[PDB]
Structure formats: structure tokens, C-alpha cells
């Protein structure tokens, strides 16, 4: 290796993890839950009507 | 390097205040979910007592 200031390799992983927490959370609480919106965050106008 | 630097710290911090907007959606959105069943309920008996 030539780099080691900045372990640009080890913090790439990190993104994609972060992304992956948001679906993960959101299946598991769809899933606790019998139903889908679960919240005002998905789409407004499913719940709202 | 030290505008980098600077600015790297500048979008870190402002990354780590952006969440701040959804948890307080979040807040509001819990505190109305009660205004909107009330509002259900209260449609329900006067649907009743009509």
C-alpha cells in the first residue's frame, strides 16, 4: 500500500452500509407491523386516501 | 489542503445537522397521527349521533 492518512478502502464499504441500514429498518418495521406505510414517510397519498 | 480540510469538516457537520429536520418530521408526525385518529373518532359518534 502507499496511502494510510486517509484508508479511502475501508471507508467506501461504510456508504454503502449506511444505505443498507434504511432498508433494513424499514423492511423490519413494515414486517412488525401488518402494515405497509407505517408512517408519513412513504408515499402520502396511499395513506391519505 | 486546508480548504479541503475546512470544507470536509463544514459537510460533515452539516450531514450530521440535516438528520435533526427528519427527527423532528418524525416528532410531528407521531404528535398529529393523535389528531387524526381524534378527529376519526369524533367523525365516528357524531356520524352516530346524526
Known amino acids: 500500500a502507499q496511502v494510510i492518512n486517509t484508508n479511502s478502502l475501508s471507508l467506501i464499504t461504510q456508504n454503502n452500509i449506511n444505505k443498507n441500514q434504511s432498508a433494513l429498518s424499514s423492511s423490519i418495521e413494515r414486517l412488525s407491523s401488518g402494515l405497509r406505510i407505517n408512517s408519513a414517510k412513504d408515499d402520502a397519498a396511499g395513506q391519505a386516501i | ?50
Open chain 2, 1 to 50: 489542503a486546508n480548504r479541503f480540510t475546512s470544507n470536509i469538516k463544514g459537510l460533515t457537520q452539516a450531514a450530521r445537522n440535516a438528520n435533526d429536520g427528519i427527527s423532528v418530521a418524525q416528532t410531528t408526525e407521531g404528535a398529529l397521527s393523535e389528531i387524526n385518529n381524534n378527529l376519526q373518532r369524533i367523525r365516528e359518534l357524531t356520524v352516530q349521533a346524526s
